[PDB]
Design a protein around this ligand. Structure first.
Ligand SMILES: [Cl-]
Ligand SMILES: [Cl-]
Ligand SMILES: [Cl-]
Ligand SMILES: [Cl-]
Ligand SMILES: [Cl-]
Length: 193
């Protein structure tokens, strides 16, 4: 079908956080996960469409932190919303971008935001160029929000939020397709010297 687009999740892995060595200050970023990307978060319709993705985080927002991801290509710091993983002392901050590398990392610091095209955050009629899929890049960093014990800590799998597919084609827009944005759970290690 022309509008038979279906969602697929985009996921990032707790297991890529390096060991956290502590030689304190809260909040502070304790490491970045390896950024991930999915070209086909929405895919499958036979008719090309102008599409955009609205990300709504759905974990509790604890506060803000200023940061500049080592990954991505922003040259100045931004405020990021710190989201509660549920594990005391541990939050995450999120950035998302369009799939293609020229598009910028968008700090998640609003109750919802268009991750691609960023033009849509100030132009309600802006969409990606017409094509047959919508994808994205996902960036996450862990934040110490309080004192961490030594040793291993398990992070549960968390749904960071969802991307709503919007389009200037009503039949596709009105499906309100949504794709989950996932933090795959895992184990981190703190070495408190
Ligand atoms: Cl993925
Ligand atoms: Cl992909
Ligand atoms: Cl950044
Ligand atoms: Cl969850
Ligand atoms: Cl239409």
């Amino acid at each position: 079908g022309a509008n038979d687009y279906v969602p697929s999740p985009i996921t990032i892995n707790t297991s890529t956080l390096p060991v956290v060595v502590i030689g304190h200050t809260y909040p502070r970023v304790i490491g970045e996960l390896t950024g991930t990307s999915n070209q086909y978060i929405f895919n499958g319709g036979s008719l090309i469409a102008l599409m955009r993705g609205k990300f709504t985080p759905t974990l509790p927002k604890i506060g803000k932190i200023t940061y500049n991801f080592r990954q991505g290509n922003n040259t100045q710091s931004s405020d990021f919303d710190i989201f509660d993983t549920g594990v005391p002392g541990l939050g995450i901050i999120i950035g998302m971008a369009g799939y293609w590398p020229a598009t910028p990392l968008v700090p998640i610091n609003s109750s919802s935001i268009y991750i691609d095209p960023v033009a849509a955050n100030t132009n309600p009629n802006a969409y990606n160029g017409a094509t047959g899929s919508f994808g994205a890049r996902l960036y996450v960093a862990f934040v110490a929000t309080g004192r961490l014990p030594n040793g291993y800590v398990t992070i549960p799998t968390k749904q960071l939020g969802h991307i709503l597919l919007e389009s200037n084609r009503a039949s596709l827009n009105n499906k309100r397709l949504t794709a989950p944005v996932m933090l795959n759970g895992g184990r981190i290690q703190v070495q408190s010297l």
